[model samples]
Structures are given as structure tokens and as C-alpha cells.
Target: ASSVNELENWSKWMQPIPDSIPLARISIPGTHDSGTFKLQNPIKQVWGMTQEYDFRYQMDHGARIFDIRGRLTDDNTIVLHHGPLYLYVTLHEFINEAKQFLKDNPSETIIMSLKKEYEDMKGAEDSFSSTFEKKYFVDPIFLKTEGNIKLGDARGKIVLLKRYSGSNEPGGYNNFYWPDNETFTTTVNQNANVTVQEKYKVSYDEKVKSIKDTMDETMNNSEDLNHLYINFTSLSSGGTAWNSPYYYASYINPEIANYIKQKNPARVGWVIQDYINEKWSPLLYQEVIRANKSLI
Candidate 1:
């Protein structure tokens, strides 16, 4: 079954894994925001959810996102790319796909680890070729004039990035940014639920907007609206997906691993499934996942 040797793969992660994924991210210099917000006070982070723009496979079947990553070069340029797909993807096509993906998946929210937040590329797609393999900064970097700016003088410095299945994040219960009717769980949970909290950085550039523009202009352009199940909010940080002590056969204890074996699950990320090969694998529009993240 969709398991990696039944190792209790609770959305196991692989940083900088190899693949021909269509997207890749470059890195710049940034750190944890100077301060943190509490739900009781200014709770809920104020970052934009990232959206994807996939043109060629916009209508293709099962063209999932393989992987994404980022790194800082000595010259300081931000480049992003994904693991390669089956076909040769060009820059024109890349931008088209980016735009299309966004049109289909708007408002996809994303959380970033301080070290791995570089994949949040928010600029419009350019005429960068498929230099993902040669790897010296395949894509170009833009200069932002905002907070913690990391401007660079290097013309073509290369940076690597991280990517895979799509992702999301929500405020803590204290703040309760989501609706009060958010799904909660105790027993009878039927699916594996995951909740990941990673800090991130935002950019002033309008890549997603540009892509959205192109998407709107296209005929039959429509955004994808798939959402994650509400059971996700029920997940706790200390919980595990392993079956109840009953799985031990002889160790009949009351303690359980909080297993939520999602039947025909709609989510595929670190907080839910392994996502290495999700049926709805790569999310086309960022908004689709972004909106889905807000379900709970």
C-alpha cells in the first residue's frame, strides 16, 4: 500500500532530495522575525500564502510537483527550481505553468522553516531556461527593498531551493484565527493528521499576481478549490500516527498513536501523508492549497 516499508512514516521529510521536479528555490539571507506574536496579544503571523503557476500540465493528468529547495550563493542571488518532470520544460512554458497553477489554486498558505523558507518565490516567472541540472543559479534573482533586505552585487550567483508536495499552516488555538466550528477530535479519528509550524519570510515582488493576470486572460481559466479535511485541526504536536496499543496484539494498553487512517484522503503533506506520490500530487495553483489550509 502507499507506505514506505510500513516504517510509521508520519509524513517523513527528505531535505534537498534528488529529482527532476519542475520547481526549485534559491536562497537569500534572512532570519527569524525579530519578535513573535501571541494569540492573546497580536497572534497569527502575517505572511502571504505562496501560489504555484503551472502552464503546460495545467490540464494534463497527474503532473504532480516532485520537489523544491533553496540555497544562498556567495554572490547572493535568489533562484528557484523544482525537481525535473518527465518532459523538457522551457522558461516560456514555466511562466505559463506558474500562471495556470495559480489560477487553479489560489490562496494556498505555506509555512517555512527559518533555514528552508527560500522556496517562497513570489516574483513573476522570467525567461530563465531549464538550467536546473547544470546548477549554477539556473533562475535569476530579484532585488527587494523591504525588511531585512539582502541585496547582492553578483550578477548570476546561484542558489538552490526545496520543493515537493504542497503545504500549509494555521494559528494556534489561543488565537483561533480559524472559525469556531473548526473540527476537533478525540476518538473515532479515521485519518492521519499532521500539523507543522515553520517560520518564513515575505517579499514585495508580485510574481503570483503577474501569474494570476495571465491566468485570468486565458480562456477557460479557473482556480482549483480543493481543500483539506477539517480533521487536521484536531492534530496535536505530541501525537503520533501509529495504530493504538491494540496493534501490538499483546500490549493492550489504552494509549494510542492517534492514528487517523485517511480513507481516500484529500491532503498530501508532512501533516497528513508522506506525499511523495500523492494521487493529487503536485498542486497547480498555490491558492488551492492555501485556501485548503484554512479549512480547520
Candidate 2:
């Protein structure tokens, strides 16, 4: 029973969870723009960066999912990017980190959502799907099974959530209609329907409301394993100083954390956040992970 409150050892928290549960039913903590930690420049940091730490740090702190945006390079490699700016991180770098983490804690699994953030560079040898399939997804670390993935099957592997088109491979969650900056619902597969709230370019109040609304819906429908809810608590807007992601996260993280603490909801869905750090008041990731105590 002590393991239920062992928030400090968040890296292996999933060890206590049962294997029969579908991954969609778990209240997972995830990071938005997970590879943007390397950007330290002031101007780029304002608009580009969403995380302050690396992928391993995020995983160690109980983040099960990653939002990986990549660009097809001229040399036929998939490098992390946020639109036009290269994030100085690579898809392989993330996979290596996840592989090491899974090796160290074999009970856990990583859900990686891969998206093509920008256009392919000129003289690129292949399309985005081809390069990723031929070079990256071929790794043994990636889970080859697809559709309604179970925790038992996903342990010690990276479950891909395909956001790009032209997939010649068969594995992981299939891509669905993800509209730009709006809350919407779609089916990932025959057995799963996903609801996503990713309104990034909205006012702080509006974004918070959207996150809370989605969380409430997930809690009310806690018993439904067929529905997966993904709520993003990250917001972006113009202005470098006051409106940066760090500034909003400073307020939003604690607000959502406290909300979860007060309600103690059985399921808070898959919360994707920006600027994940321990310094936050109650720690958003901790609260999200703790919500899984019902599962244990």
C-alpha cells in the first residue's frame, strides 16, 4: 500500500498498475513539445521551448507520453523541430533515452506521439514516413503491435501514436483527425475513441477552462476504456516576457495540481503539460500519477 503514495519513485510507478488495463484507461502524465529543452536563446525560448528538462528527466518524473515534432533533414534523418526552428534534439536521441529508461524500469511503457512539424528539407532522400520507418521506427525498442494497446504488451517499449500520413508500417495507435488548436473528438481505432483538448493559442482563462472541462469529462466517464482523453495544459501567444509558456505554466500548473488535489478524481485523463518541474506547488505530474491510485 505504501507504493501507492511513493510519488518520489515516479519512474517505476506503473509497476504497481495491473497489466490487464488498456493503456487508454490509465491517467498518464505527458509533456507537450517534449524535446524543446535545448533551446536557451531568449527569443527562441519565448516561442519555441516548452520544457526545461531533457527527455530522461521527464520520464523519471512519471511522464509516460511525449509530443515529438520532427523535421526530415537533407541527410535523411528525423530531427526534433518546432516549425522552422530545429530543437537541437533528434528522434533517435529520444528513443535512446526511452530505451534506457525502459531497460532500467522494465515495468513502464512510453507513448510517443510523432508529428511532422515542418516541411521536408530540400534534397532529402525520402519522404517523412519512409525515412522514419527505414531508419527510426525499425528499432526494436518501438512496439510493433497496434490498436487498443494493453499495458502488458506495452511495457518496456515505445508505443507510437502516428500523426503523420503514408505509413507503410503496421504498429501503435493509428492517426486521427487532429484539428489545429481546438478541442475535438475522433476515433483512433475501432476499439478506441480519443478526445483531445489542445487549444494552445487561447487566453489563459479559456485554456484552463478547456483543460478542466476535459478532465471532468474523463472523470465522469472513468469506466469507459474505449475512450481516451488527452488534455494539454500548455498555452502560447505573442510577447516574449509576460506571455511565454513558462509564465503561463507557472500559474496553470499549480492551478491544475491543486484542482486535482481537491477533487481527488479517479481519472484525470492523459495530462500533457509544459515546463514540467518539481518546483511547482503540488507538482502536476505527481497529482496526475496519484490519480491512478484507484487502479492499484
Candidate 3:
């Protein structure tokens, strides 16, 4: 069999997993600032973008979880952003791209974690949510309810990771809920059965150890295999620090990739990374799929 590198299709490889396998039990590769690749320029460079490649390129390389941060423009356009700086792509524009990708790769699933940003207006959250519900949420690609989500069921669809619930009648009530950052951070009342901890250290050894420590404890503390843990391998040194986010990612990704390669597949959860390189990106997805190899 060709490696994920040579293979044109990656999702179909996951289809061999037993039907009994819980959706959360699978390993997924993802990016931190998925849409930031398109906005790189002299002025935008200072904002600390996470990914170097565009959204579609990452998808083709087997990135399943997408962390999308968005804001509402004065014209009501839903634009993506990295903090206050506007990213080049809008929500509608990127959603169309996602939709097309799913159409082309029917065996795959995409997880979009929508984060609210730039509270410049009195009702900024309300405005963004309304626009999302009307423009993107209504799309047939979105999975309506969070409960009963299975890898097989969600194949070829987009699962909304709706962390924002501003309205009393929040649209994502039926979606995944992310509590404040902590180990085992999944909110109990929601669907998907996944918890996320996005913390990462700027120090390379500390960063790798922190993520590995949590992966072993949180991802494999039990044999239930019904919960998903998101280990964030993405971190930024921030301005004034000697290291840049890209350099930090480049240094840490290979270490984390090696660590992940040596583990039991089931112990690896959603590995949301930054500046994914050829050295680890392929290995990351390859091992993730290998982790599920025994299910059947």
C-alpha cells in the first residue's frame, strides 16, 4: 500500500475501522489558525499567524480539525481574523471551499471549531452568530445535532465545533461545547464526547512534555475509548520573545511527531498543530490511522 503521501485519498483509509468504534476514539490532525495562510503580508506578519499553508492544502494533507476565528465587518460580512487583524478569507468564502472539498473527498469529515473575535461593537457576538446561522450554519454540510455522531455517520460532512453560545437559544446547543481550558475540558452536557485542552508552552522541551503528559493521562487514562482529547502542539512565543511561532512549531512538531509515532494508536487523540511540515505531517496522519487499525 502507498503511504498517505502518495495516496490521493486519506479518508477512505479510516473506513476500515469497526463500526463499533466511537467517533471520539479516533485520532485527527488539525491546524490552529486554519485560515491565516491567505493573509500573510508585511502588515499581517506581526499578528503571529499559525499556519503557513492555505486551508485546502492542509485538508489535502489530512488535516481534519480546523480552528477558525471570525469577526463581523461593518458591511455585515463574516471575515476570519487572527486577534484584531483581519484574515484575507471570509467565513462564506472559506465555507464554500470546505463544501467543495467535501464534495470531492466524500469519505472524509471536517471539524470546524468556530471562535468569536473582535468585540468592537455593542452586539458583536450577536451579529456574528446571526450571520453564521444565516449564511454558513444553514448549509447542508453542517451536522445538525451533536449526539449520535459517529465517524462513519459524519464522513463527507462538516461537524461544527461551536464554542460560542451567546444567544439564549444558541444555534450550537446541539453541538460540541468547550469549557474553559483545562485537562479533560469537554463540557458534559453536549455531544461528540470530546474534551479539548489548547494550552502549550513556548519552551520546546516543556511544550512537548506538557502535550505528551496530557496525551498519556487524559487520552489513555481509561479503556472506555469513548472520549476524544485534543492536545494542542501549537504555541506562540509572542512579541519580544526571541522565538517565533513558526520556529517554535518547527522545533516541537518533529519531537511530538516522534512521540506520537511510538505510542499506541488509540492513545493519540485530536492533535491540533501549527506550521505542519513534511517531516511530521504525513507521519502524524499515518499513525493516527494506524491507531485505528485494530478496530476491525
Candidate 4:
């Protein structure tokens, strides 16, 4: 493995990893917005375009967990958006891309954590759910269920991190609310396992210290290796947090890379980030793959 080829297709290499191992236990690297690269430059920065790659290429390069934030647009269709502005692709488009990816890569699994953003719309969550149910059920891509799940069961399927489950519908709504600014664990049968620290830290010094602290705390308390650990390397500061996505990531990404290098492979779980670039993104994922050696 050349880093160049590995960066091009990490999931293909992961095919040999045992499916019996719960996905939560694996060290996965993820993009925060996951699908904002297509947005027009300058304008796209406001909505927080997180990656240089599109949804399909991301999966191609070993990004298994996708943080997809969408909203029901005025046209009654679900489209990806950063804030008020709508990104070019629709939910249907992203899903279609994922479906095709799975068709091409049967040895892989995708975890799409969908969140509703446009909250002011009338019955927004319900609208998104109805549309989601129709689309998800209609498509063969989603791994549908209401109980414990394993990586083997989720292989070649989209394991959802459903953030908009209505209280009335409990049958198969296994998705959940991955709370921010918290460190928690979950089971294979559970909805989602996470450790998020998205709170704003005013200065670079503050941000670096907090990032290091959370990483140490998460690695120390990660008793159940069967579950997932999502350590958010992205952050915002100031009142409006108007800095470019690169600004924040610059302060934290190197720290994350260095931290992982010092730790045992098993200790480095997921590192959710913003503005991922060639500078350090590939090496970060390299650490993730190396972390899997702990399982061996």
C-alpha cells in the first residue's frame, strides 16, 4: 500500500476486516458536513463545507460514517443544506450515489447520520420522516431493523443514524439523537455511539487544550470496545463563529494526528472533522487504519 492508493481506496482494503466485530469498535474517520464540496466557493464556506471530496469519493476512500444534514425544501423534497442555503444535491441524489457505491463495493457499510436543519418549516421533522420512510423503504440500500445490529448485518447497507425519530413511530426507528458536547457509549443493539465536543473555544490555545483533553478522556473511558467513539476535531469560536472551516481545523488536525501517533491503535476511534484536506487528512485516516491493528 502506497499512501496514494490507500487514500484512493481505503474501504476496499477494509474488506478483510471481520464483519463480526461491531462497527462501533472500529476507528473511523468522518467528515462533518460530508457532502458540501460541490457548493460554489466563498458562498459554500458559510454553510461549512467540510470536505474536498464528494459523498461517493469519501466512501471510496474509507470514510464510512457520513454526517449528512438535510432539510425539507420549499418544493417538498429533501435536500442537503448547511444553514439557510441549499446545497446543489438532493437527498435522493446522495442516496442514489450511496446505492451505486454499495453495488460496486459489497464488502463495505455506510452509516448516514441524518439531521433536520430547517426547523421553522411546518412539520419539518414529520415531512422529512415521511419522505425518508418512502425513499428508504423504496430503496434496497438501507439496512432496516429495530434491534441490535452488527457490522456483518450492516455490510453493503446504509446503517442509519436517524436523528428525527417521531415518538409515535417506534417499530423500526432505531436512529437516535447523538448529543453534542458529551462523551458516551452504546451497544451494538443501540442506535448510535458517540463522543462529541463541538463547543466553541475562543482561542487556539483553548481549542488545542480542549481537543487534547477530550481525546485523552475518551481513550481512557472507552471501556466497551464493542461500541463507537466519535471525537469531533472541529470547533467554532466567537459570537458568530465566522472563521473559515480551515481556520478551526488547522488548530486541531495536527494535534489530532500527533495524539493518535502516541497512543495505542485501539485507543484512536473516530475523528469527525471539518475542512479535511490533503495536508493531514490522509495521515489521519492512516492512523485510523493502523488503530484497527489492535483488533488483530
Candidate 5:
């Protein structure tokens, strides 16, 4: 008889997958605001917190992608931020955690979606993109190879999904046009196109419908590796106790998990979500990882 511990070792879940498959073809779980778990103030939590656990917990539960928002600080270092609120986490902190996780579980790869969340501090000398490239991205832990990266090449490395401009480096997924708060499609390269559903500032029903619609499209096109689909299951409304991101996730997480369980779609795309944890009746991350069984 198998125990639940099998699922607990989700960090190594990708070990059996064939290395030839492009990263785009895999159904991966991801976190939104991946560094915001340290917010202790109630008002800040209500408006900004999206994740309850730290990065290692998230990676151990099979999260392969991370939505990292950073602000250039006065000391010429990058710190995690959610708008103006400092998240008490730094870019290096997240990197160290990821590096250790990859070192321990060398079969996995991490796709980091980095975005500039706020203005630079007064004493910062370099631009956001320049600082990121000069100080952080140059590390050997980051995979520098670009264009339809495959599992074989990406193993034990961080794949940069660049969201900021002025990128002088050539590696990982290229930056594309991501319009604010709407579901849209754009080109990633001549060989690939991406469709994204990120309707964050909307009603619950509307957000749910958009998620389903984009997921359905991904399912229908499961075999097309050239089309990358990203579905963000995070919602933010009035920034109050009643309509915060947490409020929406409590409803949306279970609903989407149940939907995936019933449909058992061959592909669910890269799902970047909010408040991922074990408490949900049907765990969202597990269901997302289970969808990749067909791939194995």
C-alpha cells in the first residue's frame, strides 16, 4: 500500500519525465508573489500577502515557477516588494533557497518570473534590469541557454522568465508583451506563442470563468508545444478583509482543484496561484502535478 508520503516528495516528481520534452509542454504549479510570506501586519497582509509559506515549502510541494517582484534598494541590492510594502524578503534569500533545493533535488528546474514591482531607491546607482543582470543573473546556478528550453538542459538550474526590459543577457524565456489585468495572447518567439489569463481585479465569478476558458483552450491544444499557456489563479479586489486575495483564493483554489480532478485534462498549463497550502480539501498543487502523469 502506498502512503501519502509519496505525494510529500513532490520535489522529485519530475525525475521520471523524459528530458526531451520542452519546459513549455509540462503542466507546472507556480506561486504568485513568491516572496510575500513574511508580511505580519494585518493591513499589509490584507492587501499584499499571497503566499503563507516560504519558498522552500512551495518548491517541495511541486511548484516549478515563481512570480518574483523586486525593487532596487538604496544599497544597490534587490529586495522583494508588493507595491510600496517591503515584503521583508530579498532576492538573494529566494535564490539561496532555490539553489539548495535544486542541489538536493537535481532532477527539477525552476522557472522564475521576475518583474520590477516599484521605483528604485534614491541612492541606487544602476537601473533595475542592469542591477539584476550584473549582480544576480550572472550566477552559474541560472541556466543561460535560451529558446524552447528542454528538461535535459534545464535540470538543476533556474530558468529566468524575464518580465523587465533592458535585458542584455540571452537565456531562458524571452520577455513578451504582458498587458495589465487582462487575458491576452502574444508572441514569445518565432516558434512559440503564449496565451495568458491574468484577470486579477475582477469579481469572483468573472475570474473563475476566465480561468476555465483559458484552461479549456490549453486542454484542447495540449499537444502543441509551440503554444505556451499561462493561467494565473490569483485575484485582488478592494484590498479589504472581505475581498482580499486570500478571500478569493479560499473559494477559487478548491473550485479549480475540483474542476481539474474531474476533468483530468492532459494539460493545465503553468498555473501561478495564491495561498497554496495543504489545508484545501482538494490540494491545488497536487492536482496540478497529477496532470503530468499522462506525460510520464
Candidate 6:
């Protein structure tokens, strides 16, 4: 239980993730569910806050397990697809007791009230007492390596704790994002984690609207596919933004160039992505959105 509140495996993944969201997973609510809460973090597509976690940026097999085969190894394959740059696999598991709510209601309506427990837990996020399925969020990451330790390299290291520009300040950036979409996911600071102020001040709707708008535009451009959950990430901003293999390559493997790739390569051109570096870099998270002309 102590691990529930304190920094755990998925610390960094959750750090930049959005908060003011009630649309959580059914993983814990299910009578007896004990497994993984998958998240989609690929090359061009970073990550987003939807009703669920998806491959927003799979232009070409970004999420495909086959991409992990050769040099990365089999177990490494899973980690490569699922792991963060810091750890092997990063996931968001509902660490709260959802059954308690079900027991109290005996009804199927699994609405978590926006009440005390939520507020208190939000108030004490980094304090080491907040519940996962409640107000707080939990993202667990695992990494693969030569040795045998349950945790991977740099396991549970606090990547960043988030609070945007105007909020009261929470003291960390884990699983949080900026106030508005702003067309970018800039590091903002290479200095420290979020305090509470940034979180409180975040304009959730505006920011999310920006995200949706970008996805809409990208999909509209791609004639190959009509529907998509785009991941328009900029590798220039390391950490979660640069967590995937392609993302890592943009920084480390500059020569490996190609525009948009796919999460499910077999499925012809639906997913579209963009790659920017150095000069033309958005300087923010990304400047403008791009689509694959081949699909268009």
C-alpha cells in the first residue's frame, strides 16, 4: 500500500500525464482484475489523455511487437514496445480498491464521486498516502537488463512531477501536463519537477481541445485513413516524449530517417506522424502538425 502513494516504476510516465480526468480504466473495477494497464507511447506520437490509452503515433509499426525482435531481444522486444527510456515497461495500474465502491453500491454504476477522498488524495499526491484509483494516478514501469532484479535500470526514479504555469504547485511532475495544449510538450524546465501551482492553473479543456484539434487536422490530411488517435510527439523534448525506440533514435540515431511510421504496419496508411529536430523544431512541443503525403 505504501508503494501506492510513493514514487513507483511508472513515475515518469505519469508525471506529464493529464490529471483533471475521471475517465480512468476498468482494470481495477472488474471484480478480480490483476494485470497490466497498457499505455501507447510510440515514435512520432507521444502520448495523450483520452478515455483510454492508445497508439496515437503509430505511423508504422511503432507499437508492433515484431519491431522488437532482432537486436533488442524477445523480452527486450516487449520492453522496447512497452518500456520507457528509463525503465523496461511503463504502465498505469489502478492501485485503488475499486471493489469497495462496487460493494457499497451493489450497482453497476461505477462513478467515482468528485469528493473528499479525491481531493485529499490530490492534496497529498506526493505525500505518500494518495490512492491510485481514487484522485491519484499510478504508472508502473519495468525495464529489461543483463542482471536479475525485479526492477529495471533507473527503476522508480522520479522522472518529473507536473503542475503547469499558474496552479498552486504539487512539488513533482509525475503523470501531469501543462495548462493548455499550446501546440507543444516543451520540457518547460530542465531544472526540477512540478510544484502544485501548475496543476491547479491548467486549463484542461483548452489544452485537451488543442490535442483533439491537432489529431483531427492530421487525420483530415491523411487520405489513407479516416479515423486515428494521433501521437504528434517531438523527440527534442526527452523523457516521456522521447520514451519509445523511434523517439530514442531521433535523438541518438539521427541517420535513421523516415517521416511517418506505423504502429500496425500491416494495416496500410492510417496512422500519420512527423519528425522535427534542431532548427525547425517547434521550440515549444511542436509548431504545426504534419501528415504523410503518401496517404494523402
By lDDT, the better pick of 1 and 3 is 3
Residue-level lDDT tens digits of model 2 in 161-254 = 9999979999999888999999999888888899999998898889989999999999899899899999999999984788999999999999
Best by TM-score: 2
Count clashing residue pairs per candidate.
Answer: 61, 0, 1, 3, 0, 53
lDDT of 1 at 272: 14
Off by over 4 Å in 5: 1-8
Residue-wise C-alpha lDDT for candidate 6, range 107-198, written one tens digit per residue: 11221111111111223333222332222333322111111111122223212222212223232222334443234333323422211111
In model 5, which residue pairs have backbone atoms overlapping below 3 Å? none
Q: Assess candidate 6 and give its lDDT.
A: 0.23
The C-alpha lDDT values of all candidates are 0.21, 0.90, 0.66, 0.66, 0.90, 0.23
Q: Which rank order by TM-score, best down to worst? A: 2, 5, 3, 4, 1, 6
Taking all chains together, the TM-score of candidate 5 against the true structure is 0.97
- Who is ahead in TM-score, 1 or 5? 5
State the local distance difference test value for candidate 4. Answer: 0.66
| Ten contiguous residues minimizing lDDT sum, candidate 1 | 22-31
TM-score of every prediction relative to native: 0.21, 0.97, 0.84, 0.82, 0.97, 0.20
Q: Rank the candidates by lDDT, best first.
A: 2, 5, 3, 4, 6, 1
Model 4 over residues 136-199: C-alpha lDDT tens digits?
5456667766554566788788877667764233332255445565444443344544455555
Off by over 4 Å in 1: 1-68, 80-98, 105-258, 261-275, 278-296
* Candidate 6, poorest ten consecutive residues by summed lDDT: 25-34
